[PDB]
Write a protein that binds this ligand. Structure first.
Ligand SMILES: CCCCCCCC/C=C\CCCCCCCC(=O)O[C@@H](COC(=O)CCCCCCCCCCCCCCC)COP(=O)([O-])OCC[N+](C)(C)C
Ligand SMILES: CCCCCCCC/C=C\CCCCCCCC(=O)O[C@@H](COC(=O)CCCCCCCCCCCCCCC)COP(=O)([O-])OCC[N+](C)(C)C
Ligand SMILES: CCCCCCCC/C=C\CCCCCCCC(=O)O[C@@H](COC(=O)CCCCCCCCCCCCCCC)COP(=O)([O-])OCC[N+](C)(C)C
Ligand SMILES: CCCCCCCC/C=C\CCCCCCCC(=O)O[C@@H](COC(=O)CCCCCCCCCCCCCCC)COP(=O)([O-])OCC[N+](C)(C)C
Ligand SMILES: CCCCCCCC/C=C\CCCCCCCC(=O)O[C@@H](COC(=O)CCCCCCCCCCCCCCC)COP(=O)([O-])OCC[N+](C)(C)C
Ligand SMILES: CCCCCCCC/C=C\CCCCCCCC(=O)O[C@@H](COC(=O)CCCCCCCCCCCCCCC)COP(=O)([O-])OCC[N+](C)(C)C
Ligand SMILES: CCCCCCCC/C=C\CCCCCCCC(=O)O[C@@H](COC(=O)CCCCCCCCCCCCCCC)COP(=O)([O-])OCC[N+](C)(C)C
Ligand SMILES: CCCCCCCC/C=C\CCCCCCCC(=O)O[C@@H](COC(=O)CCCCCCCCCCCCCCC)COP(=O)([O-])OCC[N+](C)(C)C
Ligand SMILES: CCCCCCCC/C=C\CCCCCCCC(=O)O[C@@H](COC(=O)CCCCCCCCCCCCCCC)COP(=O)([O-])OCC[N+](C)(C)C
Ligand SMILES: CCCCCCCC/C=C\CCCCCCCC(=O)O[C@@H](COC(=O)CCCCCCCCCCCCCCC)COP(=O)([O-])OCC[N+](C)(C)C
Ligand SMILES: CC(C)CCC[C@@H](C)[C@H]1CC[C@H]2[C@@H]3CC=C4C[C@@H](OC(=O)CCC(=O)O)CC[C@]4(C)[C@H]3CC[C@]12C
Ligand SMILES: CC(C)CCC[C@@H](C)[C@H]1CC[C@H]2[C@@H]3CC=C4C[C@@H](OC(=O)CCC(=O)O)CC[C@]4(C)[C@H]3CC[C@]12C
Ligand SMILES: CC(C)CCC[C@@H](C)[C@H]1CC[C@H]2[C@@H]3CC=C4C[C@@H](OC(=O)CCC(=O)O)CC[C@]4(C)[C@H]3CC[C@]12C
Ligand SMILES: [Ca+2]
Lengths: 612, 612
């Protein structure tokens, strides 16, 4: 409602702009190329040259919009004050006509305005210029930023000659080199990037203008990685690579690897690409400094430390499994209630549970599971206190779904610990969750293997893709037929056919008949009711044939899509593991990657050598 | 038989045409370019120049058919009356030779006929010129219509100079601008469309000739949408769009949206595209006025009103389900007939059914289901009285299959209402239909969701595609093997293996063995008959392996075809919903789309603004 009222207000204000032009002979003669009408209109007063349209625009703005050079020249000669006028409206605050002629690439009217001393530092701070999905252009705020984004190299040279600050930042802190990365035509933005670094002749040289961050802390090199700009990433790596020698077909290149790999506790380029929402960012992982660095970290220190943790976790779940197998049980102390009561054993009290030497061996195994579950909560839960408590930890959970599965496992172990201590009934329900969550967390360590790794991306995309959007159609066919199956057998004896004896069992039986994992109900010794055969024949056609195989056909497409991009998806699993594993392990266990300088006359930087 | 006798009569009349030419020296010398023979033949009388062929043709028609200019000139000089002669035959009534030279594009013979004052208003009303599947050309009735369709711009200019009525309509009411849309070469028809609007210089200007309807009420703009002419639709929208401004790469266009969106109670362009048989018409839904209008109606008012009705219907079916769960049942009053009688409960009488406070809570829930079923019939059934009673409501049912599923649900609720009142046995059969039709109508509201929506197009196309044409082969393999299975066990005791104990159960068991949803019959404690193992091994290979997986392979192709055109099929579901929902809800709930004029100096029209 709010996004649609903003689009409705922008449309009504654009129609009100065209109305106010037609209502006044001044702005209408600026819109058309009526030179003689602007001559005759201006002869009888100052003639309200400071007349505002619906957008806060003047007539000199209107001649700038419609590329009316001869109309705009008359207005500047009559009123030279119109050159310094911004648009006064929230949609276009601060926009002058020097902005408009730059965007329209009117070369003669840019020189005409700067001859009348037009400001090159005027900031278009209106809401039609901000970086938003509502806006189709993000050109920045300054006329040098507008000229760089329309690829007018001759205006970019002409604005810097008149004093345009090349280091100017907008509200987002973006310099002109940041804004060029955010542009759709990426080949032209490479050429404009080179032209604007050529004017950095120690101009406010605290930083060389390709090292200036925005308010997010991103330089143009890091912004090209976060936004998935692979064209600008290859172009900006040419400054960061150094050819050592060329021996025929061979070449030894030395890569800078300073802004790619984390120097201190700042987030590196690898951490930003993993933790971003754009999926074009993960094509930077296939680039010639970055692909070699990821393979180097994994083979040297990533995969040994990951297979050590996978073997410790696999021994831990085997210890948890056996203390659930040997859980303390005794024969039941009450008598059987109904003939449907199948329970023979109940669970011992806490005083009874630890009395034999086999109960003390289990107690050692049970304390390992408790201590291991506390260590999981001491490692993984303090992330929510360091990160955002709700929001920023939420992208960690959308990023890694195995975070919550080992957190939920660790809470289920501590729930059944408390039930052990207070002697509460029903420890089978915390244990059964912890058994299946404990063993299905071993599928986390499948990503140590190129072949096994993206199988869990298939399992994820079949659940939260195919299943989560087709289960709503399945649930409503189950609810329809299970309700029919319930009332058909509601008058019958359940001892012969008891699949639908109460309504929760009729729901569970129809779900199992859907998936064809129990057989169709049949007796052949009694007369089943007449509507059963018609309803189950209709169920067997729509559910077991049609809608079950429809889901299997969907998941076969999900298999095919993930197996196509299989190696690209495994490399993203490796970066996310290596980032996590380097962050949590100390620097003594993780040596820094590449070769450092300072013993080779190269600085304090850390270099990576590729021979190609 | 009737379509084939008409093709047989047209073929015999075309062979009789070539016979009558060869039988007469006049028409044979017109067919060939025998100038000296037509000279010598014409010297001995008037010489029967008014001689009719099999098609009612003259010799001047024959010289026009075979592009014989020098033969046709001799015939006009000898007989000037032959210029005014139409063909006198039902297949070619009214066709003159000015029609024939125009179609053959004989430039010299068109000028030669109009020099002899040939009629440009002659109407070819024969059955070979009407719009029919029997005819390969539909060129209209007038020579200006024939010249526009053969793309002869020089004849079109030359016929208008001699007084051709450009506003002339044929039997279908089609002007020359209507007929150009019905032509296969669409690029040439765009150029001929522009040339014929250029001659509308206030000529009978009640309407500008692109606003003249045919007898179906369609203008050329609406006819391009109904016929799926996307080339002519983009060309005719250029008159209906207005560029407000151009700001560098940006452009603001204002679209007319008058003939696209419904002004009054007339059918709009969106209603005509949904309710038409052609499926090329639904490519108009992806066009730049229409795609933005559909997304605007759905996001503002379509999807809120559709999810309100989906939540009210979902609460209604839950109320219907629980009054079927708690239906009035008592223990049976008679004794058990046979040992196959499994019935324990029967249903209470009407006097017994409402005696407790829990029966009055159900009575409130049962009256909600009755009132809701009457409202479904008061909303949906009066369409058949407003539309066609049989025919035109039939395309509504072929268009929406969820119309009949909620009508059949509403009748099943009122059948079990009457059985409740008269205390009739067997309310389980109207309830079981109403339970599965009630809950599977919740799949109607899946089309509020882009992902869930065209799942029901898959379910439809697998039933009425794959299943309805392969069930005939399955039914005959079931009937063959169930008859064999019946007579094999006809001499056996059914207490051990009773799958085929009578012939309706042998049919039902073999259907379930086909679908592999009951296990294969086996005892292992008795000797089964010898032909069972041979027949069931043959059944398991042809039916469970081969013909079951053959159907699953078909439906996997139906899945792949619908998932390919997935978003194009969901947008057609949204237009059909929005059309239905705007028609039934009052105008106070549905504001009209776009921005109106009259506060912006644009008229009383309603405009839609796209910034691109
Ligand atoms: C990939 C493979 C790798 C290896 C996997 C090995 C797989 C096989 C593993 C084991 C073999 C299978 C069971 C052997 C059979 C009986 C053994 C026994 O004496 O149990 C006794 C008690 O034992 C317990 O209560 C165990 C509960 C805690 C186990 C943890 C020990 C603590 C060590 C912490 C270590 C830290 C962990 C590391 C943390 C990082 C009782 O047994 P019972 O009553 O005589 O049973 C009758 C059986 N029957 C009916 C069949 C007759
Ligand atoms: C392991 C041994 C250690 C013992 C040491 C000390 C313990 C000693 C304590 C008591 C001794 C008494 C004997 C109890 C025996 C077993 C209890 C049982 O299951 O059945 C019992 C019911 O009791 C319950 O089931 C309680 C319900 C479970 C509550 C737990 C919620 C989990 C919340 C956290 C997870 C949130 C998950 C959400 C995630 C999304 C018995 O009732 P019954 O079986 O119904 O009898 C009828 C049988 N019939 C149905 C066949 C007719
Ligand atoms: C915050 C700590 C909890 C408070 C501690 C003291 C509790 C004081 C309460 C009762 C004390 C009186 C003793 C009588 C015996 C038990 C009777 C009883 O009331 O048990 C009840 C509690 O059972 C539970 O559900 C425990 C789980 C609750 C909180 C989870 C633990 C937090 C661990 C961190 C993880 C959090 C993350 C969760 C994510 C999964 C349920 O009863 P029952 O199950 O139906 O069995 C009946 C047993 N009887 C038949 C033998 C009689
Ligand atoms: C105690 C209980 C255990 C603990 C709690 C368990 C919580 C769950 C664990 C981890 C949850 C962590 C976040 C969800 C996973 C991320 C998915 C995602 O990226 O977004 C997804 C949507 O997003 C959703 O669907 C929202 C989740 C729905 C509700 C969560 C409960 C689901 C039940 C879970 C049980 C499932 C039933 C199976 C049998 C039981 C987008 O999908 P995608 O994956 O990015 O790509 C697929 C789309 N594609 C096909 C077009 C390509
Ligand atoms: C994707 C997943 C969706 C879930 C799928 C399935 C949901 C299942 C999940 C959980 C159900 C299991 C609950 C167990 C507790 C018992 C209570 C019970 O249900 O039975 C009770 C009955 O009461 C009813 O009949 C309520 C159901 C009516 C229909 C509402 C469906 C809810 C989903 C709507 C949304 C649909 C969403 C579809 C898209 C919009 C008691 O039954 P009884 O014992 O026989 O007693 C009868 C007494 N009698 C003999 C006098 C007659
Ligand atoms: C997506 C989810 C949304 C919500 C879905 C909620 C899902 C769950 C919904 C409900 C919970 C499931 C049942 C609860 C269990 C018993 C309740 C009870 O007292 O029933 C009593 C009578 O009740 C009836 O007869 C009901 C029949 C009419 C229902 C409609 C009410 C009228 C309101 C009109 C409203 C207008 C509707 C709107 C129209 C637009 C009898 O019960 P019992 O004999 O004691 O049963 C024994 C059970 N046992 C064997 C297990 C012991
Ligand atoms: C819900 C409670 C409310 C009650 C209130 C008032 C009601 C009180 C009224 C009577 C009380 C008497 C007790 C009756 C008990 C149930 C009746 C029954 O099913 O079986 C009965 C047969 O009776 C029939 O089935 C009649 C046949 C059905 C006709 C309906 C046609 C539907 C037409 C429209 C739909 C068109 C669909 C077409 C669409 C394409 C009993 O016979 P039996 O069971 O065979 O016994 C032998 C058992 N054996 C086979 C196991 C050997
Ligand atoms: C037009 C209204 C109908 C006339 C009203 C009065 C009818 C007068 C008739 C008998 C009155 C005598 C009373 C004795 C008790 C019943 C005996 C009997 O003959 O019942 C018969 C009628 O059962 C039906 O099939 C009813 C359905 C017929 C028309 C559908 C209703 C129209 C609703 C609009 C929707 C239309 C759309 C349809 C699309 C689905 C069948 O008998 P039974 O089922 O085998 O059960 C025997 C019961 N007994 C064992 C207890 C004895
Ligand atoms: C009380 C009973 C309930 C109420 C009455 C029920 C009446 C039915 C409900 C709605 C019917 C409304 C019209 C039919 C649906 C439209 C289909 C259509 O467009 O034409 C189709 C042919 O057309 C036919 O096949 C004619 C229908 C056959 C007879 C109808 C009974 C079918 C039984 C229904 C039970 C099915 C068995 C399943 C399990 C039981 C063309 O197919 P398509 O879809 O356009 O595209 C597929 C072709 N493609 C794959 C090449 C792309
Ligand atoms: C796509 C859907 C097609 C449907 C497929 C399935 C159709 C089935 C649908 C409905 C059948 C169920 C009816 C129930 C009523 C009982 C009557 C009955 O059938 O059994 C009776 C037998 O009589 C027969 O044997 C008739 C069948 C002979 C073959 C004709 C097949 C019809 C389809 C032809 C067109 C094929 C189309 C294929 C393509 C051209 C009684 O049997 P009994 O009780 O054992 O008594 C025997 C007494 N004895 C012991 C003395 C020996
Ligand atoms: C008494 C002692 C011997 C118990 C031993 C316990 C270990 C088996 C536990 C302790 C901490 C656990 C770790 C805590 C946190 C993590 C991070 C976790 O990361 C993710 O799941 C990322 C999610 C994703 O990217 O999808 C993977 C499991 C792991 C290594 C755990 C593996 C199992 C560990 C080593
Ligand atoms: C006792 C019963 C009732 C417990 C039910 C258990 C389920 C809730 C568990 C068991 C298996 C689990 C799944 C096992 C594997 C995966 C893949 C995993 O996918 C990834 O994270 C892959 C992405 C990547 O590797 O980068 C996401 C969680 C998911 C779907 C799990 C979700 C939770 C599931 C369905
Ligand atoms: C006592 C009261 C509270 C009962 C409430 C009854 C409602 C749940 C009913 C009344 C009228 C029904 C509507 C009547 C007609 C239609 C049109 C119908 O349109 C189609 O099915 C189009 C078919 C297709 O395009 O495939 C969809 C269901 C709907 C909205 C129905 C939805 C359910 C409604 C709102
Ligand atoms: Ca089985």
């Amino acid at each position: 409602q709010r996004r649609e009222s903003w689009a409705q207000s922008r449309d009504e204000q654009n129609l009100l702009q065209q109305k106010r032009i037609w209502e006044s002979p001044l702005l209408l003669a600026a819109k058309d190329n009526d030179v003689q009408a602007l001559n005759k209109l201006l002869k009888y007063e100052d003639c309200k040259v400071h007349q505002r349209g619906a957008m806060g625009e003047t007539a000199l703005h209107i001649a700038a919009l419609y590329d009316n050079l001869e109309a705009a020249m008359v207005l500047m000669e009559a009123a030279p004050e119109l050159v310094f006028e911004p648009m006064t409206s929230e949609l276009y605050e601060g926009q002058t006509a020097l902005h408009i002629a730059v965007v329209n690439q009117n070369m003669n009217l840019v020189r005409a305005l700067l001859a009348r001393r037009a400001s090159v530092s005027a900031r278009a701070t209106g809401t039609a210029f901000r970086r938003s999905p509502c806006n189709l252009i993000y050109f920045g705020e300054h006329p040098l930023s507008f000229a760089a984004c329309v690829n007018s190299e001759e205006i970019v040279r002409l604005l810097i000659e008149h004093g345009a600050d090349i280091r100017a930042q907008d509200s987002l802190g973006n310099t002109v080199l940041h804004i060029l990365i955010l542009q759709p035509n990426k080949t032209f933005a490479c050429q404009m990037y080179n032209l604007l670094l050529s004017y950095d002749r120690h101009g406010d040289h605290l930083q060389p203008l390709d090292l200036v961050p925005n308010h997010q802390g991103l330089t143009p090199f890091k912004l090209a990685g976060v936004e998935g700009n692979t064209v600008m990433f290859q172009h900006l790596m040419q400054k960061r690579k150094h050819t050592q020698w060329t021996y025929g077909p061979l070449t030894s290149t030395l890569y800078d690897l300073t802004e790619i790999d984390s120097s201190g506790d700042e987030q590196s380029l690898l951490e930003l690409i993993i933790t971003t929402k754009k999926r074009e960012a993960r094509q930077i992982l296939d680039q010639t400094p970055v692909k070699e660095l990821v393979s180097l970290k994994w083979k040297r220190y990533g995969r040994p430390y990951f297979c050590m943790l996978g073997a410790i976790y696999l021994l831990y779940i085997i210890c948890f499994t056996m203390c659930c197998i040997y859980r303390p049980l005794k024969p039941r102390t009450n008598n059987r209630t109904s003939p449907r009561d199948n329970t023979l054993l109940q669970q011992k009290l806490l005083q009874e549970a630890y009395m034999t030497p086999k109960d003390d061996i289990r107690l050692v195994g049970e304390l390992v599971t408790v201590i291991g579950a506390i260590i999981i909560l001491l490692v993984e839960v303090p992330d929510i206190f360091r990160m955002g408590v709700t929001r920023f930890f939420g992208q960690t959970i959308l990023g890694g779904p195995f975070h919550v599965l080992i957190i939920t496992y660790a809470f289920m172990v501590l729930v059944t610990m408390v039930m052990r201590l207070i002697s509460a009934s029903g420890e089978v329900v915390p244990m059964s969750f912890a058994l299946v969550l404990g063993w299905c967390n071993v599928m986390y360590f499948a990503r140590g293997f190129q072949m096994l790794g993206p199988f869990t991306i298939m399992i994820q995309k079949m659940i939260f893709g195919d299943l989560m959007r087709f289960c709503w159609l399945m649930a409503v066919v189950i609810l329809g037929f299970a309700s029919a199956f319930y009332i058909i057998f509601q008058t019958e004896d359940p001892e012969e056919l008891g699949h639908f004896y109460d309504y929760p069992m009729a729901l569970f039986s129809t779900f199992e008949l859907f998936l064809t994992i129990i057989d169709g109900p049949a007796n052949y010794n009694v007369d089943l009711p007449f509507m059963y055969s018609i309803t189950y024949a209709a169920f067997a056609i729509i559910a077991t044939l049609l809608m079950l195989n429809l889901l299997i056909a969907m998941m076969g497409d999900t298999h095919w899509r993930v197996a196509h991009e299989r190696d690209e998806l495994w490399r993203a699993q490796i970066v996310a593991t290596t980032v996590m594993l380097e962050r949590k392990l100390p620097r003594c266990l993780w040596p820094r990657s590449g070769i450092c300088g300072r013993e080779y006359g190269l600085g304090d930087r850390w270099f990576l050598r590729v021979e190609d």
